[PDB]
PDB file of C-alpha atoms and ligand atoms in Angstrom:
ATOM      1  CA  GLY A 159      36.201 -11.490  -4.421  1.00  0.00           C
ATOM      2  CA  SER A 160      34.050  -8.601  -3.371  1.00  0.00           C
ATOM      3  CA  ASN A 161      32.821  -6.069  -6.207  1.00  0.00           C
ATOM      4  CA  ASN A 162      31.408  -3.750  -3.520  1.00  0.00           C
ATOM      5  CA  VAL A 163      32.899  -0.480  -3.424  1.00  0.00           C
ATOM      6  CA  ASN A 164      30.953   1.532  -0.530  1.00  0.00           C
ATOM      7  CA  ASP A 165      34.431   2.305   0.728  1.00  0.00           C
ATOM      8  CA  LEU A 166      35.221   4.600  -2.000  1.00  0.00           C
ATOM      9  CA  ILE A 167      31.688   6.222  -1.924  1.00  0.00           C
ATOM     10  CA  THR A 168      32.043   9.551  -0.005  1.00  0.00           C
ATOM     11  CA  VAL A 169      28.411  10.785   1.039  1.00  0.00           C
ATOM     12  CA  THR A 170      28.308  14.417   1.404  1.00  0.00           C
ATOM     13  CA  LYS A 171      24.606  14.949   2.261  1.00  0.00           C
ATOM     14  CA  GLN A 172      21.456  12.666   3.002  1.00  0.00           C
ATOM     15  CA  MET A 173      17.868  13.426   4.151  1.00  0.00           C
ATOM     16  CA  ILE A 174      14.705  11.785   5.006  1.00  0.00           C
ATOM     17  CA  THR A 175      11.762  14.049   3.579  1.00  0.00           C
ATOM     18  CA  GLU A 176       7.917  13.251   2.978  1.00  0.00           C
ATOM     19  CA  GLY A 177       5.703  13.215  -0.216  1.00  0.00           C
ATOM     20  CA  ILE A 178       2.891  14.819   1.004  1.00  0.00           C
ATOM     21  CA  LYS A 179       3.646  17.366   4.017  1.00  0.00           C
ATOM     22  CA  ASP A 180       6.610  17.510   6.072  1.00  0.00           C
ATOM     23  CA  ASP A 181       4.536  16.271   9.162  1.00  0.00           C
ATOM     24  CA  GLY A 182       6.648  14.115  11.217  1.00  0.00           C
ATOM     25  CA  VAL A 183       3.370  12.015  10.286  1.00  0.00           C
ATOM     26  CA  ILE A 184       3.434   9.807   7.455  1.00  0.00           C
ATOM     27  CA  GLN A 185      -0.268   9.456   5.758  1.00  0.00           C
ATOM     28  CA  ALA A 186       0.140   5.785   4.720  1.00  0.00           C
ATOM     29  CA  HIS A 187      -3.476   5.070   3.599  1.00  0.00           C
ATOM     30  CA  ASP A 188      -3.095   8.259   1.680  1.00  0.00           C
ATOM     31  CA  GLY A 189       0.092   6.849  -0.170  1.00  0.00           C
ATOM     32  CA  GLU A 190       2.565   9.157   1.626  1.00  0.00           C
ATOM     33  CA  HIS A 191       6.357   8.783   0.288  1.00  0.00           C
ATOM     34  CA  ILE A 192       9.248   8.298   2.783  1.00  0.00           C
ATOM     35  CA  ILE A 193      11.502   9.841   0.539  1.00  0.00           C
ATOM     36  CA  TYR A 194      15.828   9.026   0.972  1.00  0.00           C
ATOM     37  CA  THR A 195      17.769  11.553  -0.953  1.00  0.00           C
ATOM     38  CA  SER A 196      21.566  11.271  -0.894  1.00  0.00           C
ATOM     39  CA  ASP A 197      24.290  13.233  -2.410  1.00  0.00           C
ATOM     40  CA  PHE A 198      27.931  11.542  -2.786  1.00  0.00           C
ATOM     41  CA  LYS A 199      31.128  11.652  -4.579  1.00  0.00           C
ATOM     42  CA  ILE A 200      32.529   8.344  -6.705  1.00  0.00           C
ATOM     43  CA  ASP A 201      35.922   7.746  -6.561  1.00  0.00           C
ATOM     44  CA  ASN A 202      37.766   7.363  -9.788  1.00  0.00           C
ATOM     45  CA  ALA A 203      39.146   4.132  -8.535  1.00  0.00           C
ATOM     46  CA  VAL A 204      35.738   3.019  -8.998  1.00  0.00           C
ATOM     47  CA  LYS A 205      34.944   0.684 -12.101  1.00  0.00           C
ATOM     48  CA  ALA A 206      32.251  -0.860 -14.362  1.00  0.00           C
ATOM     49  CA  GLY A 207      30.700  -3.336 -12.892  1.00  0.00           C
ATOM     50  CA  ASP A 208      31.482  -2.366  -9.322  1.00  0.00           C
ATOM     51  CA  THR A 209      28.680  -2.331  -6.810  1.00  0.00           C
ATOM     52  CA  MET A 210      27.162  -0.112  -4.233  1.00  0.00           C
ATOM     53  CA  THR A 211      24.593  -1.043  -1.504  1.00  0.00           C
ATOM     54  CA  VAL A 212      21.969   1.271  -0.102  1.00  0.00           C
ATOM     55  CA  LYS A 213      19.762   0.258   2.859  1.00  0.00           C
ATOM     56  CA  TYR A 214      15.876   1.170   3.263  1.00  0.00           C
ATOM     57  CA  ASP A 215      14.930   1.443   7.004  1.00  0.00           C
ATOM     58  CA  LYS A 216      13.149  -2.032   7.762  1.00  0.00           C
ATOM     59  CA  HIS A 217       9.693  -0.341   8.246  1.00  0.00           C
ATOM     60  CA  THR A 218       9.466   0.747   4.349  1.00  0.00           C
ATOM     61  CA  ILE A 219       9.157  -0.971   1.284  1.00  0.00           C
ATOM     62  CA  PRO A 220       9.654   0.308  -2.567  1.00  0.00           C
ATOM     63  CA  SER A 221       6.360  -0.538  -3.249  1.00  0.00           C
ATOM     64  CA  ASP A 222       2.751  -0.831  -1.184  1.00  0.00           C
ATOM     65  CA  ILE A 223       0.638  -2.153  -3.712  1.00  0.00           C
ATOM     66  CA  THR A 224       2.906  -4.379  -5.940  1.00  0.00           C
ATOM     67  CA  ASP A 225       5.338  -6.745  -5.988  1.00  0.00           C
ATOM     68  CA  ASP A 226       7.824  -4.970  -8.789  1.00  0.00           C
ATOM     69  CA  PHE A 227      10.560  -3.452  -6.396  1.00  0.00           C
ATOM     70  CA  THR A 228      12.770  -2.434  -9.087  1.00  0.00           C
ATOM     71  CA  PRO A 229      14.951   0.721  -7.982  1.00  0.00           C
ATOM     72  CA  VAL A 230      15.160   3.921  -9.961  1.00  0.00           C
ATOM     73  CA  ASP A 231      18.663   4.089 -11.734  1.00  0.00           C
ATOM     74  CA  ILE A 232      21.443   6.399 -10.345  1.00  0.00           C
ATOM     75  CA  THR A 233      21.872   8.827 -13.254  1.00  0.00           C
ATOM     76  CA  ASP A 234      23.959  12.138 -13.930  1.00  0.00           C
ATOM     77  CA  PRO A 235      21.779  15.618 -14.286  1.00  0.00           C
ATOM     78  CA  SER A 236      20.993  14.416 -18.141  1.00  0.00           C
ATOM     79  CA  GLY A 237      19.836  11.324 -17.308  1.00  0.00           C
ATOM     80  CA  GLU A 238      22.882   9.421 -18.623  1.00  0.00           C
ATOM     81  CA  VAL A 239      22.627   5.764 -16.390  1.00  0.00           C
ATOM     82  CA  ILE A 240      25.609   5.800 -13.700  1.00  0.00           C
ATOM     83  CA  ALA A 241      24.273   2.496 -11.793  1.00  0.00           C
ATOM     84  CA  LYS A 242      21.386   0.108 -12.399  1.00  0.00           C
ATOM     85  CA  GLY A 243      19.740  -1.233  -9.339  1.00  0.00           C
ATOM     86  CA  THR A 244      18.499  -4.556  -7.950  1.00  0.00           C
ATOM     87  CA  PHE A 245      16.446  -4.781  -4.699  1.00  0.00           C
ATOM     88  CA  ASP A 246      16.515  -7.591  -2.274  1.00  0.00           C
ATOM     89  CA  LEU A 247      13.452  -7.623  -0.253  1.00  0.00           C
ATOM     90  CA  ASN A 248      14.505  -9.770   2.675  1.00  0.00           C
ATOM     91  CA  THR A 249      17.197  -7.101   3.432  1.00  0.00           C
ATOM     92  CA  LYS A 250      15.643  -4.207   2.201  1.00  0.00           C
ATOM     93  CA  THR A 251      19.034  -3.455   0.129  1.00  0.00           C
ATOM     94  CA  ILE A 252      19.686  -2.091  -3.167  1.00  0.00           C
ATOM     95  CA  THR A 253      22.692  -3.336  -5.021  1.00  0.00           C
ATOM     96  CA  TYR A 254      23.470  -0.646  -7.624  1.00  0.00           C
ATOM     97  CA  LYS A 255      25.818  -2.226 -10.195  1.00  0.00           C
ATOM     98  CA  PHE A 256      28.296   0.765 -11.990  1.00  0.00           C
ATOM     99  CA  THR A 257      27.770   1.052 -15.795  1.00  0.00           C
ATOM    100  CA  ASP A 258      30.768   2.349 -17.783  1.00  0.00           C
ATOM    101  CA  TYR A 259      29.992   5.544 -16.869  1.00  0.00           C
ATOM    102  CA  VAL A 260      32.655   5.465 -14.215  1.00  0.00           C
ATOM    103  CA  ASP A 261      35.071   4.300 -16.828  1.00  0.00           C
ATOM    104  CA  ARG A 262      34.262   7.229 -19.437  1.00  0.00           C
ATOM    105  CA  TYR A 263      34.242  10.059 -16.658  1.00  0.00           C
ATOM    106  CA  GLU A 264      36.230  11.166 -13.667  1.00  0.00           C
ATOM    107  CA  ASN A 265      35.416  13.336 -10.444  1.00  0.00           C
ATOM    108  CA  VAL A 266      31.989  12.200 -10.426  1.00  0.00           C
ATOM    109  CA  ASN A 267      29.815  13.119  -7.776  1.00  0.00           C
ATOM    110  CA  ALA A 268      25.815  12.111  -8.108  1.00  0.00           C
ATOM    111  CA  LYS A 269      22.595  12.233  -6.308  1.00  0.00           C
ATOM    112  CA  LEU A 270      20.064   9.831  -5.731  1.00  0.00           C
ATOM    113  CA  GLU A 271      16.397  10.222  -4.539  1.00  0.00           C
ATOM    114  CA  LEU A 272      14.389   6.782  -3.163  1.00  0.00           C
ATOM    115  CA  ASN A 273      10.666   6.827  -2.918  1.00  0.00           C
ATOM    116  CA  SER A 274       9.246   4.416  -0.416  1.00  0.00           C
ATOM    117  CA  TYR A 275       6.081   3.331   1.401  1.00  0.00           C
ATOM    118  CA  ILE A 276       5.534   2.087   4.931  1.00  0.00           C
ATOM    119  CA  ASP A 277       5.630  -1.734   4.836  1.00  0.00           C
ATOM    120  CA  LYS A 278       2.397  -3.060   6.141  1.00  0.00           C
ATOM    121  CA  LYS A 279       4.047  -6.107   7.239  1.00  0.00           C
ATOM    122  CA  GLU A 280       6.446  -4.337   9.657  1.00  0.00           C
ATOM    123  CA  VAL A 281       3.890  -1.563  10.558  1.00  0.00           C
ATOM    124  CA  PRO A 282       0.573  -3.384  11.546  1.00  0.00           C
ATOM    125  CA  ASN A 283      -0.852  -0.611  13.630  1.00  0.00           C
ATOM    126  CA  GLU A 284      -0.202   3.208  14.366  1.00  0.00           C
ATOM    127  CA  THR A 285       3.044   3.715  16.049  1.00  0.00           C
ATOM    128  CA  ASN A 286       6.200   5.894  16.529  1.00  0.00           C
ATOM    129  CA  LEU A 287       9.330   5.139  14.139  1.00  0.00           C
ATOM    130  CA  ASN A 288      12.763   6.328  14.132  1.00  0.00           C
ATOM    131  CA  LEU A 289      13.385   5.565  10.453  1.00  0.00           C
ATOM    132  CA  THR A 290      16.989   4.974   9.358  1.00  0.00           C
ATOM    133  CA  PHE A 291      18.254   5.095   5.975  1.00  0.00           C
ATOM    134  CA  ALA A 292      22.008   4.046   5.277  1.00  0.00           C
ATOM    135  CA  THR A 293      24.295   4.688   2.490  1.00  0.00           C
ATOM    136  CA  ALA A 294      27.001   2.742   3.928  1.00  0.00           C
ATOM    137  CA  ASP A 295      29.239   3.773   5.618  1.00  0.00           C
ATOM    138  CA  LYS A 296      26.891   6.704   6.340  1.00  0.00           C
ATOM    139  CA  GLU A 297      23.184   6.587   8.203  1.00  0.00           C
ATOM    140  CA  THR A 298      20.595   9.346   8.563  1.00  0.00           C
ATOM    141  CA  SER A 299      17.645   9.051  10.896  1.00  0.00           C
ATOM    142  CA  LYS A 300      14.095  10.834  11.491  1.00  0.00           C
ATOM    143  CA  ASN A 301      11.309  10.334  13.970  1.00  0.00           C
ATOM    144  CA  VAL A 302       7.781   9.887  12.531  1.00  0.00           C
ATOM    145  CA  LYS A 303       4.420   8.778  13.435  1.00  0.00           C
ATOM    146  CA  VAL A 304       2.633   6.461  11.101  1.00  0.00           C
ATOM    147  CA  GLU A 305      -0.890   7.256  10.796  1.00  0.00           C
ATOM    148  CA  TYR A 306      -3.640   4.836   9.197  1.00  0.00           C
ATOM    149  CA  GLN A 307      -7.397   5.796   8.225  1.00  0.00           C
ATOM    150  CA  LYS A 308     -10.647   5.495  10.241  1.00  0.00           C
ATOM    151  CA  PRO A 309     -14.026   3.619   9.523  1.00  0.00           C
ATOM    152  CA  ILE A 310     -16.811   5.845   8.351  1.00  0.00           C
ATOM    153  CA  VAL A 311     -19.403   5.406  11.012  1.00  0.00           C
ATOM    154  CA  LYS A 312     -23.025   6.076  10.517  1.00  0.00           C
ATOM    155  CA  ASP A 313     -24.777   4.595  13.619  1.00  0.00           C
ATOM    156  CA  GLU A 314     -24.295   0.954  13.447  1.00  0.00           C
ATOM    157  CA  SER A 315     -22.817   0.963   9.943  1.00  0.00           C
ATOM    158  CA  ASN A 316     -18.971   1.407  10.090  1.00  0.00           C
ATOM    159  CA  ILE A 317     -16.664   0.494   7.277  1.00  0.00           C
ATOM    160  CA  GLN A 318     -13.152   1.071   5.872  1.00  0.00           C
ATOM    161  CA  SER A 319     -11.526  -0.521   3.267  1.00  0.00           C
ATOM    162  CA  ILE A 320      -7.915  -0.361   0.919  1.00  0.00           C
ATOM    163  CA  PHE A 321      -6.570  -1.759  -2.254  1.00  0.00           C
ATOM    164  CA  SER A 322      -4.447  -4.075  -0.617  1.00  0.00           C
ATOM    165  CA  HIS A 323      -2.614  -5.510  -3.977  1.00  0.00           C
ATOM    166  CA  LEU A 324      -2.426  -4.627  -7.638  1.00  0.00           C
ATOM    167  CA  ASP A 325      -1.284  -7.179 -10.405  1.00  0.00           C
ATOM    168  CA  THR A 326      -0.787  -5.219 -13.446  1.00  0.00           C
ATOM    169  CA  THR A 327      -0.251  -8.305 -15.764  1.00  0.00           C
ATOM    170  CA  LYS A 328      -3.340 -10.252 -14.861  1.00  0.00           C
ATOM    171  CA  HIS A 329      -5.219  -7.005 -14.483  1.00  0.00           C
ATOM    172  CA  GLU A 330      -6.346  -7.502 -10.991  1.00  0.00           C
ATOM    173  CA  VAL A 331      -6.984  -5.784  -7.893  1.00  0.00           C
ATOM    174  CA  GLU A 332      -7.553  -6.757  -4.336  1.00  0.00           C
ATOM    175  CA  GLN A 333      -9.625  -4.992  -1.898  1.00  0.00           C
ATOM    176  CA  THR A 334      -9.481  -5.558   1.771  1.00  0.00           C
ATOM    177  CA  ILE A 335     -12.601  -4.492   3.510  1.00  0.00           C
ATOM    178  CA  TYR A 336     -13.155  -4.231   7.179  1.00  0.00           C
ATOM    179  CA  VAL A 337     -16.909  -4.902   8.055  1.00  0.00           C
ATOM    180  CA  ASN A 338     -18.127  -3.675  11.547  1.00  0.00           C
ATOM    181  CA  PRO A 339     -14.558  -3.348  12.717  1.00  0.00           C
ATOM    182  CA  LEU A 340     -15.997  -1.602  15.769  1.00  0.00           C
ATOM    183  CA  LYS A 341     -17.797  -4.686  16.621  1.00  0.00           C
ATOM    184  CA  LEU A 342     -21.277  -3.332  17.105  1.00  0.00           C
ATOM    185  CA  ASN A 343     -24.741  -4.934  17.059  1.00  0.00           C
ATOM    186  CA  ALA A 344     -25.337  -4.396  13.435  1.00  0.00           C
ATOM    187  CA  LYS A 345     -28.729  -5.444  12.385  1.00  0.00           C
ATOM    188  CA  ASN A 346     -29.976  -6.529   8.910  1.00  0.00           C
ATOM    189  CA  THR A 347     -26.216  -5.839   7.534  1.00  0.00           C
ATOM    190  CA  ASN A 348     -25.652  -5.776   4.124  1.00  0.00           C
ATOM    191  CA  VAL A 349     -22.454  -4.816   2.219  1.00  0.00           C
ATOM    192  CA  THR A 350     -22.213  -3.922  -1.323  1.00  0.00           C
ATOM    193  CA  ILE A 351     -19.214  -3.643  -3.690  1.00  0.00           C
ATOM    194  CA  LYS A 352     -19.582  -1.951  -6.554  1.00  0.00           C
ATOM    195  CA  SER A 353     -17.346  -0.367  -9.649  1.00  0.00           C
ATOM    196  CA  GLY A 354     -16.609   3.440  -8.888  1.00  0.00           C
ATOM    197  CA  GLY A 355     -17.754   5.142  -6.141  1.00  0.00           C
ATOM    198  CA  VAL A 356     -19.581   4.980  -2.981  1.00  0.00           C
ATOM    199  CA  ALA A 357     -19.722   8.512  -1.138  1.00  0.00           C
ATOM    200  CA  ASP A 358     -19.192   8.593   2.679  1.00  0.00           C
ATOM    201  CA  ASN A 359     -23.231   8.746   3.201  1.00  0.00           C
ATOM    202  CA  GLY A 360     -23.415   5.920   0.931  1.00  0.00           C
ATOM    203  CA  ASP A 361     -24.274   7.566  -2.381  1.00  0.00           C
ATOM    204  CA  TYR A 362     -23.357   5.610  -5.377  1.00  0.00           C
ATOM    205  CA  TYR A 363     -21.318   8.054  -7.946  1.00  0.00           C
ATOM    206  CA  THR A 364     -19.764   6.885 -11.314  1.00  0.00           C
ATOM    207  CA  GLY A 365     -16.337   8.052 -10.129  1.00  0.00           C
ATOM    208  CA  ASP A 366     -12.911   8.394 -11.917  1.00  0.00           C
ATOM    209  CA  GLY A 367     -12.272   4.424 -12.130  1.00  0.00           C
ATOM    210  CA  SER A 368     -13.681   1.220 -12.623  1.00  0.00           C
ATOM    211  CA  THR A 369     -13.549  -2.427 -12.191  1.00  0.00           C
ATOM    212  CA  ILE A 370     -15.155  -5.526 -13.413  1.00  0.00           C
ATOM    213  CA  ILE A 371     -17.300  -7.226 -10.942  1.00  0.00           C
ATOM    214  CA  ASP A 372     -19.404 -10.544 -12.297  1.00  0.00           C
ATOM    215  CA  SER A 373     -19.799 -14.051 -11.656  1.00  0.00           C
ATOM    216  CA  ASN A 374     -16.474 -14.570 -11.661  1.00  0.00           C
ATOM    217  CA  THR A 375     -15.053 -12.072  -9.269  1.00  0.00           C
ATOM    218  CA  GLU A 376     -13.436 -13.677  -6.240  1.00  0.00           C
ATOM    219  CA  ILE A 377     -15.079 -12.870  -2.868  1.00  0.00           C
ATOM    220  CA  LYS A 378     -14.088 -14.148   0.418  1.00  0.00           C
ATOM    221  CA  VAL A 379     -15.442 -13.509   3.953  1.00  0.00           C
ATOM    222  CA  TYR A 380     -13.633 -14.044   7.002  1.00  0.00           C
ATOM    223  CA  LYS A 381     -15.019 -13.763  10.530  1.00  0.00           C
ATOM    224  CA  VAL A 382     -13.187 -11.850  13.498  1.00  0.00           C
ATOM    225  CA  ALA A 383     -13.076 -13.625  16.762  1.00  0.00           C
ATOM    226  CA  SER A 384     -14.003 -10.902  19.617  1.00  0.00           C
ATOM    227  CA  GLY A 385     -10.587 -11.569  21.051  1.00  0.00           C
ATOM    228  CA  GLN A 386      -8.854 -10.433  17.805  1.00  0.00           C
ATOM    229  CA  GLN A 387      -7.772  -7.038  16.937  1.00  0.00           C
ATOM    230  CA  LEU A 388      -7.399  -6.049  13.235  1.00  0.00           C
ATOM    231  CA  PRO A 389      -4.192  -4.521  12.103  1.00  0.00           C
ATOM    232  CA  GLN A 390      -5.318  -0.950  11.549  1.00  0.00           C
ATOM    233  CA  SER A 391      -3.037  -1.275   8.363  1.00  0.00           C
ATOM    234  CA  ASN A 392      -6.174  -2.765   7.106  1.00  0.00           C
ATOM    235  CA  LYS A 393      -3.726  -5.380   5.222  1.00  0.00           C
ATOM    236  CA  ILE A 394      -3.815  -9.256   6.287  1.00  0.00           C
ATOM    237  CA  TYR A 395      -0.763 -11.294   5.755  1.00  0.00           C
ATOM    238  CA  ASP A 396      -2.312 -14.794   7.026  1.00  0.00           C
ATOM    239  CA  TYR A 397      -5.960 -15.280   6.525  1.00  0.00           C
ATOM    240  CA  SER A 398      -5.862 -18.806   7.972  1.00  0.00           C
ATOM    241  CA  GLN A 399      -5.668 -16.758  11.572  1.00  0.00           C
ATOM    242  CA  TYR A 400      -9.511 -16.094  10.694  1.00  0.00           C
ATOM    243  CA  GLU A 401     -12.732 -17.985  10.309  1.00  0.00           C
ATOM    244  CA  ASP A 402     -13.470 -18.462   6.652  1.00  0.00           C
ATOM    245  CA  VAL A 403     -17.532 -18.178   6.618  1.00  0.00           C
ATOM    246  CA  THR A 404     -17.702 -17.461   2.780  1.00  0.00           C
ATOM    247  CA  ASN A 405     -20.499 -20.222   2.443  1.00  0.00           C
ATOM    248  CA  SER A 406     -22.417 -18.810   5.730  1.00  0.00           C
ATOM    249  CA  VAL A 407     -23.355 -15.412   4.018  1.00  0.00           C
ATOM    250  CA  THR A 408     -25.639 -14.777   0.985  1.00  0.00           C
ATOM    251  CA  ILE A 409     -23.314 -13.289  -1.806  1.00  0.00           C
ATOM    252  CA  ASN A 410     -24.799 -11.943  -4.936  1.00  0.00           C
ATOM    253  CA  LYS A 411     -22.258 -11.032  -7.667  1.00  0.00           C
ATOM    254  CA  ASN A 412     -24.807  -9.815  -9.810  1.00  0.00           C
ATOM    255  CA  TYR A 413     -26.825  -7.395  -7.510  1.00  0.00           C
ATOM    256  CA  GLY A 414     -26.131  -4.831 -10.503  1.00  0.00           C
ATOM    257  CA  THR A 415     -23.918  -3.921 -13.121  1.00  0.00           C
ATOM    258  CA  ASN A 416     -20.511  -4.266 -11.725  1.00  0.00           C
ATOM    259  CA  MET A 417     -21.903  -4.656  -8.494  1.00  0.00           C
ATOM    260  CA  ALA A 418     -21.842  -7.198  -5.816  1.00  0.00           C
ATOM    261  CA  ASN A 419     -23.674  -7.933  -2.406  1.00  0.00           C
ATOM    262  CA  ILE A 420     -23.251  -9.845   0.820  1.00  0.00           C
ATOM    263  CA  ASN A 421     -25.922 -10.172   3.051  1.00  0.00           C
ATOM    264  CA  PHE A 422     -24.621 -10.798   6.758  1.00  0.00           C
ATOM    265  CA  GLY A 423     -27.766 -10.456   8.322  1.00  0.00           C
ATOM    266  CA  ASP A 424     -27.639  -9.660  12.073  1.00  0.00           C
ATOM    267  CA  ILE A 425     -24.086  -9.772  13.155  1.00  0.00           C
ATOM    268  CA  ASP A 426     -22.108  -8.814  16.506  1.00  0.00           C
ATOM    269  CA  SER A 427     -18.742  -9.327  15.022  1.00  0.00           C
ATOM    270  CA  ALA A 428     -16.239  -7.836  12.552  1.00  0.00           C
ATOM    271  CA  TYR A 429     -15.706  -9.235   9.504  1.00  0.00           C
ATOM    272  CA  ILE A 430     -13.156  -9.099   6.569  1.00  0.00           C
ATOM    273  CA  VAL A 431     -14.090  -9.212   3.143  1.00  0.00           C
ATOM    274  CA  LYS A 432     -11.295  -9.743   0.653  1.00  0.00           C
ATOM    275  CA  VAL A 433     -12.306  -9.109  -3.165  1.00  0.00           C
ATOM    276  CA  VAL A 434     -10.327  -9.783  -6.325  1.00  0.00           C
ATOM    277  CA  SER A 435     -11.688  -8.247  -9.405  1.00  0.00           C
ATOM    278  CA  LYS A 436     -10.386  -7.431 -12.682  1.00  0.00           C
ATOM    279  CA  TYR A 437      -9.975  -3.942 -14.348  1.00  0.00           C
ATOM    280  CA  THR A 438      -9.764  -2.590 -18.005  1.00  0.00           C
ATOM    281  CA  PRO A 439      -6.340  -1.953 -18.594  1.00  0.00           C
ATOM    282  CA  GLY A 440      -5.479   1.610 -20.145  1.00  0.00           C
ATOM    283  CA  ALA A 441      -3.702   1.570 -23.699  1.00  0.00           C
ATOM    284  CA  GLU A 442      -0.168   2.963 -22.731  1.00  0.00           C
ATOM    285  CA  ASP A 443       0.047   1.889 -19.035  1.00  0.00           C
ATOM    286  CA  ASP A 444      -2.798   4.298 -17.702  1.00  0.00           C
ATOM    287  CA  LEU A 445      -4.891   3.036 -14.534  1.00  0.00           C
ATOM    288  CA  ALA A 446      -8.082   4.132 -13.795  1.00  0.00           C
ATOM    289  CA  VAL A 447      -9.235   1.753 -11.053  1.00  0.00           C
ATOM    290  CA  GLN A 448     -11.856   2.485  -8.408  1.00  0.00           C
ATOM    291  CA  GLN A 449     -14.291   0.370  -6.332  1.00  0.00           C
ATOM    292  CA  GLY A 450     -16.333   1.264  -3.368  1.00  0.00           C
ATOM    293  CA  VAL A 451     -18.335  -0.391  -0.794  1.00  0.00           C
ATOM    294  CA  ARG A 452     -21.611   0.505   1.376  1.00  0.00           C
ATOM    295  CA  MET A 453     -22.596  -0.761   4.232  1.00  0.00           C
ATOM    296  CA  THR A 454     -26.511  -0.955   5.178  1.00  0.00           C
ATOM    297  CA  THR A 455     -27.771  -1.430   8.512  1.00  0.00           C
ATOM    298  CA  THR A 456     -31.307  -0.994  10.422  1.00  0.00           C
ATOM    299  CA  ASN A 457     -30.772   1.644  12.719  1.00  0.00           C
ATOM    300  CA  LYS A 458     -32.571   1.736  16.094  1.00  0.00           C
ATOM    301  CA  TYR A 459     -35.349   3.977  14.881  1.00  0.00           C
ATOM    302  CA  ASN A 460     -36.108   1.030  12.220  1.00  0.00           C
ATOM    303  CA  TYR A 461     -34.527   2.962   9.403  1.00  0.00           C
ATOM    304  CA  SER A 462     -31.563   2.059   7.088  1.00  0.00           C
ATOM    305  CA  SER A 463     -28.317   3.813   7.903  1.00  0.00           C
ATOM    306  CA  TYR A 464     -25.330   3.933   5.466  1.00  0.00           C
ATOM    307  CA  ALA A 465     -21.767   4.175   5.342  1.00  0.00           C
ATOM    308  CA  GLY A 466     -19.390   4.144   2.527  1.00  0.00           C
ATOM    309  CA  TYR A 467     -15.983   3.927   1.192  1.00  0.00           C
ATOM    310  CA  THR A 468     -14.084   4.050  -2.004  1.00  0.00           C
ATOM    311  CA  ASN A 469     -10.641   3.304  -2.877  1.00  0.00           C
ATOM    312  CA  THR A 470      -8.957   4.623  -6.059  1.00  0.00           C
ATOM    313  CA  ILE A 471      -5.700   4.261  -8.118  1.00  0.00           C
ATOM    314  CA  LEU A 472      -5.073   6.604 -11.063  1.00  0.00           C
ATOM    315  CA  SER A 473      -1.914   7.225 -13.023  1.00  0.00           C
ATOM    316  CA  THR A 474       0.022   8.903 -15.939  1.00  0.00           C
TER     317      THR A 474
HETATM  318 CA1   CA B  51       3.420  13.660   6.211  1.00  0.00          CA
HETATM  319 CA1   CA B  52      36.519   5.026 -12.559  1.00  0.00          CA
END
């Protein structure tokens, strides 16, 4: 009892490459793909319903922002489907189930290409990785550096953010914002969150996407203790670790049109702000989702200083 036929798969070439620039450096916050390509022969003895496995490196994941991990089919050059796959998160393994393609054709070889992202649960901070991808029996490895973003800093105003989750059925996006990650003395701290853009220097711009921010937007604020270090990945997997101070700060969800503001007053600590807001779906399946943050503080010369950040998701 075992429909697995990896023993009948002959892998003739495998490769690990990158989606943006073959750096040896993965730009995880620019959504740089880690690409696994594998060429192989399928024995004639393989039949419809047999399965083969392919293993991701544990530090990668088929999607960095949604929970849909459905793998691309294995096809021939004309797009005829050779095998359909199901992904198992815990083992980071695809099980491909062969279609009747392998009953209809013989002496078949194929290629598959898998796009993956760094798994931020497994890669909290910048680090070196020896990635290993496996089409059992065969393994291929590559050493890389994972790099994350840095905050925009203008005097005591310092801030960064990512879209950490996207739900395309509920049409909600999650923004994880690091406020004052540098743990500076930020006087009269305000953080504004708005649909569209916020330039690095704080300037608002319409931008190339939009969200809905109103009285029903969810906004949570968490204080970071001085002994705590935030993951450079900008994604938090357990918020109970942090002090919920949502009722301690002043939050105006109607600060403007699709625009909210959080008044922190004087702080000496980092904070995490997690925002869940709705977006307007695109008629086909097109996404134009964009939301920006501005941090305002009072600098030592008693003028406002501004720092800005914008996250964007665009489709096809
Ligand atoms: Ca790269
Ligand atoms: Ca066959």
